[model samples]
Target: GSDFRVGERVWVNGNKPGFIQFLGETQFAPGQWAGIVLDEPIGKNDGSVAGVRYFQCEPLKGIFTRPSKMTRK
Candidate 1:
């Protein structure tokens, strides 16, 4: 499996830093989705995307990316 899990610190796209909040498949996106609560307000959503609520956080502080796009920090 990937070296990631809920509560683990990670970096996405080689720059954005955050912690894994949700890890698994979702109804909104195909395959797996990594729910990350970013340290900065540079994310895409507040945990809910495509009308689905995966987690909760500040606006623009949550993001969802594929596991392959994330790295351990």
Candidate 2:
């Protein structure tokens, strides 16, 4: 149970901890999305999705999800 913001640290499904880099509407969705930058290179992308770059991070170190899916931990 938590609400998150950018520049804060958050955990995903209690297995991955990443820093929130962007929090706003995305080009691929109707609602806002949370762009997280993970230190480990196991995520989905580098904060880019379908020609949209939300944030900047190393390749495979960035992932995008909803605020409700993030945990402030």
Candidate 3:
């Protein structure tokens, strides 16, 4: 019943839209998180370093997520 799928186009929250690069089977807090890339640039909020690049989004975008979600045991 879920519409989530790999390579699907979706928004990366504060970042631009990008294809679902991966998905995590083990759902995280707030459902799931997705990894996405913007066509231009997206700032990082992880408080790791400057010059943001990628973002980990929750609820899993149109496709983007962790590798575990789509991986089979």
lDDT of each: 0.89, 0.85, 0.43
Every model: Cα RMSD to truth = 1.6, 1.7, 9.6
Cα deviation at 36, candidate 2, in Å, is 0.1
Candidate 3 deviant stretches above 4 angstroms: 25-31, 43-73
lDDT of 1 at 42: 88
TM-score of 3: 0.40
Residue-pair clashes per candidate, as listed? 0, 0, 7
Candidate 3, residues 1-73, lDDT tens digits: the string is 4555656665554435565644443333344655543343452333111343334443333233443333221
User: In candidate 2, what are the lDDT values of residues 1-73, reduced to their tens digit?
Assistant: 4467678988877568889999989988889889999868889998899988999999899998888887874
lDDT for 63 (candidate 1)? 89
Instruction: Write one digit per residue (lDDT tens) for candidate 1, span 1-73.
Output: 5567689999999688899999999988689889999999989899998888999999889989998898875
Q: Pick the candidate with the highest TM-score.
A: 1
What TM-score does candidate 1 reach? 0.89
List the candidate 1 regions with Cα displacement exceeding 4 Å.
none
